[PDB]
Structure 1
């Protein structure tokens, strides 16, 4: 479910590598 603090937040950190700037409008719109 939707929630991130001192637990469920420890995860989501996984989608990062896939949730990074890899969105739609901001997908490769900056150096790095």
Structure 2
């Protein structure tokens, strides 16, 4: 749990571009 507002602002927006990887390419970030 963040500080409410602290993130979301850029957090929720972060997934508005990061998700691309945090929902695919990221998978590799684990590689076994």
Structure 2 residue runs without a partner (length 5+) = none
Tell me how many residue pairs correspond in the alignment: 32
SS in structure 2 opposite 1:25?
helix
Structure 1 residue runs without a partner (length 5+) = none
- Over the aligned positions, Cα root-mean-square deviation in angstroms equals 7.0
Could you tell me the TM-score, scaled by structure 1's length? 0.20
Could you tell me the TM-score, scaled by structure 2's length? 0.20
> Cα distance 1:20–1:5, how it changes in 2: closer, same or farther (>3 A)?
farther
